[PDB]
C-alpha cells in the first residue's frame, strides 16, 4: 500500500495473510471456513494466517490454518486478470474473536464515489521497494467507470472497478493482491491489478464481488 497508514494490530480483523513459507496475497475471511482472494493469487500449498498485524513476529493473536481445498472462478482468464477472484476452505474453522472476524458479503454493488477502505502487506513505494512487516491501509473510493475505462482502454469488463486517486500518490501494490476493499461495511472488492503503483492516471483495479455473491454462496454451500 502505497500512501497509507499504519492499520493499527487487529483493527482490519478480516484480513488474512496467504503464506507459501513467506506472505504472498492477502486474503478476506467470509465466515469461519472460508477465504475469499484472488485467482492470480492461486499456489499449491497455502497456509492462511488469520490475527495477524506484524507478519515476522507472533504477538500471540494468530492463528495458522492450512487450506483443504481451493477454487479459482470457471471462467478465470489469466491474461486478462476477468474474473480473478477464487475461495479457499480452510482445514479446521478458525475461531471468531474480537482479533479474527469475517466480512459480510454485499447485497447491492456500491455507487462510485463511495469510500472504501483497502489494507495488505505490500510494498509501500511507487518507485523502490520497501516491504512493511505490519498492516497498512488506505482509504480511497470508487471511480467512475469512464474514469477507470480511459485509463485503461479496451482492458476494463464489467467484473472490474478501479478506486484511488487520479493524481497518484495512493494506491494498493505488489503483496497487497487478493486483499479486501471494504465499503460501508461489506467486501465491494478484491486487489487485483494496476499499472505500476500509485502513478497519476493509473488507478487501482479491483475485482467487482458484488457480481460473484450467488457464485461464492452457492460453491461454499457445496463444498
Ligand atoms: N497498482 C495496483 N493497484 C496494483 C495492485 C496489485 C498489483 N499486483 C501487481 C503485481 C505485479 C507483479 C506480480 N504480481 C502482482 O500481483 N501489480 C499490482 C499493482
Ligand atoms: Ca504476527
Ligand atoms: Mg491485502
Redesign the pocket.
Known amino acids: 500500500i502505497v500512501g497509507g497508514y499504519t492499520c493499527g494490530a487487529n483493527t482490519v480483523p478480516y484480513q488474512v495473510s496467504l503464506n507459501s513459507g513467506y506472505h504472498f ?1 492477502g486474503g478476506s475471511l467470509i465466515n469461519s471456513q472460508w477465504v475469499v482472494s484472488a485467482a ?2 492461486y499456489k499449491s500449498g497455502i497456509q492462511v494466517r488469520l490475527g495477524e498485524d506484524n507478519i515476522n513476529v507472533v504477538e500471540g493473536n494468530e492463528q495458522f490454518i492450512s487450506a483443504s481445498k481451493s477454487i479459482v472462478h470457471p471462467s478465470y482468464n489469466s491474461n486478462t486478470l476477468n474474473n480473478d477472484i477464487m475461495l479457499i476452505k480452510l482445514k479446521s474453522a478458525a475461531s471468531l474473536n474480537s482479533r479474527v472476524a469475517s466480512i459480510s458479503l454485499p447485497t447491492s454493488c456500491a455507487s462510485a464515489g463511495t469510500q472504501c477502505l483497502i489494507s495488505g502487506w ?1 510494498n509501500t513505494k511507487s518507485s523502490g521497494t520497501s516491504y512493511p512487516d505490519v498492516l497498512k491501509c488506505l482509504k480511497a473510493p470508487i471511480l467512475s467507470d469512464s474514469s477507470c475505462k480511459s485509463a485503461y482502454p479496451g482492458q476494463i469488463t464489467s467484473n472490474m472497478f478501479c478506486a ?1 486517486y487520479l493524481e497518484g500518490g495512493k ?7 487478493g486483499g479486501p476493499v471494504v465499503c460501508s461495511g461489506k467486501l465491494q472488492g478484491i ?9 497519476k492516471n ?4 479491483y475485482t467487482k464481488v458484488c457480481n460473484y455473491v450467488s457464485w461464492i454462496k452457492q460453491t461454499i454451500a457445496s463444498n
Request: charged share 10%; with cysteine.
Open positions: 496475497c492470480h493469487c505490500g484511488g494506491d494498493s501494490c505488489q503483496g497487497d493482491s486487489v487485483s491489478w494496476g499499472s505500476g503503483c500509485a502513478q493509473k488507478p487501482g483495479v
